[PDB]
Amino acid sequence: ATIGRISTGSKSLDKLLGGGIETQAITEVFGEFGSGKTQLAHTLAVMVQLPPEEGGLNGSVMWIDTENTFRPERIREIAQNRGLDPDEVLKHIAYARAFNSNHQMLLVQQAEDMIKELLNTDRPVKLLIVDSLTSHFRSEYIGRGALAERQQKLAKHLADLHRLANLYDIAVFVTNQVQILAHSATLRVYLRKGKGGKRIARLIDAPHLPEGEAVFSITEKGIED
Template identity: 30%
Template sequence: MAKSRPYIWTSEVLDELQAFVSPGEIILQEGDLETLDLPHLLSARQLSDQGEESPGTVLWLDGANSFNPYRIARIARSGGKTPDEVLESVYISRAFTCYQMSSLVLEKSSGAIEKHDPQLLIITGIPSLFCHSNIPRDEAEKALDPLLEALPDLALETEMLLMTSRPDGEVERSEIFSKTESAADVVVKPVAGSRKVDVELKRKSSNNHREISLTRSRPETKPLESYVGGR
């Protein structure tokens, strides 16, 4: 059995992030999602918000095959929600090529937003899909441009748009990564240490930034059978 990695679940970083980011802005999280898993943490918070009469909805365009229903269910349970209550409000579309991701963003996202009215839009794997595409790199870079140009309008239609980029030397040295980073309003960079995680929030258009230091924590271990009923 694989050894579980330290997992951060704290409201502090989410409170800071949501105070730092204005509605309609684009966030890019760089780095290992096992260090700070914003897609699942933000989804669980949105879907478990006790202050709302009914939970919001979350739309995932998953190009990294990273959506984990068990993780959201575990976080939601800590907020007093059942897996069914939370997971029925998550809408997922997966992309396995850069062309599929382009189709999701350019052709299908607006209709999905109109239908489901998500408060959070998550897009994973954009740089990796385009950087590791089978098409020539210059063609991949050109195909990326209209996708990135469409993101600000999608962000305005939701309360928050979050992108992620996995740690990959080839990706981070590429023009594709640079273009993706330039499309973001705010960049989130977690750096893991042995006992803590430092998270930097940086606004691209100014020198405005914040740093948060988080103590590592490990999740409570539960059997898979406890999540029966979730998707």
């Protein structure tokens, strides 16, 4: 079935992404603390709700938070400044905090129930955010023996996420804070905060996709060129 593409709000980042983040894919954004990974997540959670001719998918959102970083006030700000009703935009976000990595993994199964419920309504789930994908795994699986174990558990979690993306035509967007390991996301985007506080994005290990870097700003509309 044909994939959909969610605009990020930045023409530059959209071009880097071939039009936007894809359904039937896991897009991982990685970078240091303060890079803007969670800002992009908030922005996407509003953009996906737009109609397709405005770069959205008329979609609902599910959000798994591991760091208490979801900010309903930020959603409100982005929505208002894009002509949308903040309370309606919030209504179409379903939110859960993951207590630990095992609960995070179970929450993906829990999410499937709502996905099925909304599937043939006019606002099916089209975006599933996991922010942070890795923070609980990093704190729990640590020390001698942990690299293999952690990588195994994370790969299984990502397999579960790939299944939801692919079976239900959803864009999965995940964040990873990075200061040699295998990764199984579909597309990896390195984000950094540069001079002037501009954010800069580069695709990693994607030789057939745009070489170049996108640059964008964090604004009251989420992100913009």
